[PDB]
């Protein structure tokens, strides 16, 4: 009975220890390539996600700048409540985009 208790642990340990040495072969790197790729994401972060966290500077509101002119007239059609406020946000606050356009 006691040896039967260890059997699920016994069958595990047969290849468990070798699977560290099996990690380098393809038996693991088909998924575990990230270790051989050293954080396969981008080798942590040096520049790649920097190119997109720099986009948070831009696509969030600095890209809202150019499309705000289109919204102002678009708001003027269906959003009549904000039609008056469309000019202040786009034609006045985002007027600095006129050079940037």
């Amino acid at each position: 009975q006691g040896a039967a208790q260890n059997l699920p642990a016994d069958v595990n340990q047969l290849i468990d220890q070798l699977e560290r040495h099996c990690l380098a072969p393809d038996g693991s790197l088909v998924t575990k390539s990230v270790y051989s790729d050293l954080q396969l994401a981008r080798e942590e972060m040096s520049r790649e996600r920097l190119r997109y966290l720099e986009a948070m500077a831009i696509y969030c509101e600095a890209v809202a700048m150019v499309e705000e002119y289109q919204q102002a007239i678009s708001v003027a059609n269906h959003g009549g409540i904000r039609d008056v406020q469309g000019l202040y946000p786009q034609l006045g606050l985002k007027n600095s985009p006129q050079v940037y356009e």
Partner: protein, 103 residues
């Protein structure tokens, strides 16, 4: 699944054709010890450690009496006089038996 060697060497290129087999395959693996061990440790430690629990206290005071007073007592508690006095005459006075023959 590390108990198997290709547990990671096969998952990706079978998931794309068949996205049902591998996901439940790892589920069956990890659950091969959650209900066989993790949900079955409570049942089996009330039989194994139960023997450990009962014996360890038993081994110290009661089975101690059933051991220390078993091999020199349980059969021989009246045979101590058949153990020591037997050695008093036929082992200690054993050389003294030759005394009558010698003198």
């Amino acid at each position: 699944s590390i108990h198997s060697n290709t547990q990671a060497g096969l998952s990706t290129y079978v998931s794309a054709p068949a996205i049902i087999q591998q996901i439940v395959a790892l589920q069956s693996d990890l659950s091969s010890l959650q209900s066989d061990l993790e949900n079955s440790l409570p049942d089996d430690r009330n039989r194994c450690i139960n023997e450990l629990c009962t014996h360890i206290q038993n081994l110290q005071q009661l089975l101690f009496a059933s051991s220390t007073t078993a091999q020199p007592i349980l059969t021989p508690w009246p045979l101590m006089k058949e153990l020591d006095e037997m050695g008093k005459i036929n082992s200690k006075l054993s050389t003294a038996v030759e005394e009558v023959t010698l003198e």
